[PDB]
């Protein structure tokens, strides 16, 4: 069952033939998708494309294409096993790509007149990248025998559990900077369990939690020891999963509202949290919507489609 | 200070000359706006325009134009006083217009192929009507000496007070039908007071409250004696007033979501509550936005711009 035009193999065999079919799928799929990313770099405005960090990333993708296309057609388990080593190397080599693009683009984008251009390039590049890393990680995970997982697909994911995971994480970060962190309540369908892919949530949830906690602390500088809770509601229905994250952090100002979804815009991280999360949600067939109550707080609505039966 | 291109006179004199200037303004303004509504009827699809209820309303507007244009130019207080009698008559004669349009259009709109057509006609007709009734009522109110009012403009409106007014009202209606009504909590800027025109709120608030209470009751048929509260948050900033109305009434279904803002669409009133409220909010420079958590509830966000300094 599929992410967009990308299928995650739920097949399984004892002879391990599902691993060869998966491996062969990747082998046919990855080079084409990397070619697309390279075409993306080739079409960047010249002046942005000449930035040395952008050039570095452009070269990384070329190298990846080279390694992928030089790898021989998979015929046996020894082949597949070796291909996995390559996939692991590329996953690691490219792990800082978002950060590098942010850096390379930060100034150089100001050099051009179409602001739509960079946004489009980042949405496209980052979401294609997520899709590639999902397929790749899924293949590697097929070798695992974690219970409740078929690759990266959790067969019985609890939204509440994964939210709490990221809450603990964001609270620790927040405490480190402010001395305290809002407490988080979670309500709604807290007992929901369903088949789901965690990975997008692992990107998005911490970004939105960090935003909500930061806003809460910075609007309560006089009582850091007593700040309004962040409240999270889970709604699980047959079509989608909805996670609403509500804070009393004072809201997103009218003057900032039309900018918060721009890559690089920050009123402080490096301003990628919101546009990246939205691009990811929409890529997967969901959405990310903001409701600002200026003077009071912000509600953020994450919607992700369910895995189709 | 103004609604769109319509100015509400805050002028005041002891000789009562502000009343003559206001009266003269109305006299120049109303006939033109009524002419526009008549042109709206003239352009309706023939088959809809021939509906007898639609024809009735079309005639009402013609009569109104006739009476308005036959009235002599205002020169003195006796004139103005008489013009007020006319305005009062028209206000009353036209008080059921929304209901009549709903009825006349209900079936006849199915006869045509552009669904955008009726929506546009209603948005335009209903909002122009609100604007006219606001100007008209404002003029009449200039004769009043209610404290805290300049015409229909409240100089120190409390959002909490007007919300409670409509809560009591909606709860009574709801209790009459279900035996109980959700309790309502109000939070946020509960002590806010500012200059504001109540009239749009008096339309919108009861519509949204009725929706929220109905949804809550119909999703709790087994425990009507114990239903989730409706929760209302007031956010007051320098740009707008935001009133969020949140229920745990189960949400607006995915299959219904794209229809709830259509005139006439109802899953039960007569399906005008939402599209009418949105048209009114947008006419006044605000908005009405819905966030559905299918399986849990709905958040409705009403935003109205503040009176400009
Ligand atoms: N929940 C929130 N409350 C208030 N402001 C927010 C919230 N979420 C985001 N923002 C604003 O949006 C801006 C952009 O957020 P983001 O894309 O995550 O980048 P960053 O957090 O690195 O600035 C933030 O700088 C902040 O001003
Ligand atoms: N808060 C809500 N919760 C659930 N459903 C709602 C809510 N508000 C509106 N709806 C749905 O939207 C439809 C249209 O609402 P409206 O325009 O007010 O007309 P009516 O209430 O007369 O049907 C309703 O019939 C109902 O199905
Ligand atoms: O940019 C990335 O992170 C990805 Cl596209 C690199 C990669 C390519 C192919 C296979 C696995 C990882
Ligand atoms: O349809 C209405 O309610 C309004 Cl437009 C009728 C009216 C016209 C002119 C003055 C006052 C009321
Ligand atoms: K941003
Ligand atoms: K409707
Ligand atoms: Mg952030
Ligand atoms: Mg209604």
From Swiss-Prot, chains A, B:
* Keyword set includes Protein transport: no
Q: What class of enzyme is it?
A: transferase
Which residues are recorded as modified (N6-acetyllysine)?
124, 165
GO biological process terms held by the UniProt record:
branched-chain amino acid catabolic process; isoleucine catabolic process; L-leucine catabolic process; lipid biosynthetic process; regulation of acetyl-CoA biosynthetic process from pyruvate; regulation of glucose metabolic process; spermatogenesis; valine catabolic process
Per UniProt, activity regulation is: The ATP-ase activity is up-regulated by potassium and rubidium ions but not by sodium ions. Up-regulated in the presence of apo- or lipoylated-DBT/E2b subunit of the BCKDH complex.
Chief site of localization: mitochondrion
According to the entry, every stretch annotated as the Histidine kinase domain falls at 91-308
Q: Which residues bind Mg(2+)?
A: 211
Q: Could you identify this protein by its name?
A: Branched-chain alpha-ketoacid dehydrogenase kinase
Subunit note: Homodimer. Homotetramer. Dimerizes through interaction of two opposing nucleotide-binding domains. Interacts with E2 component of the branched-chain alpha-ketoacid dehydrogenase (BCKDH) complex. Competes with BCKDK for binding to the E2 component; this interaction is modulated by branched-chain alpha-keto acids. At steady state, BCKDH holoenzyme contains BCKDK and BCKDHA is phosphorylated. In response to high levels of branched-chain alpha-keto acids, the inhibitory BCKDK is replaced by activating PPM1K leading to BCKDHA dephosphorylation and BCAA degradation.
Q: In which tissues is it expressed?
A: Expressed in heart and liver.
Gene of this entry: Bckdk
Query: Intact protein stretch covered?
Result: 69 to 405 of 412
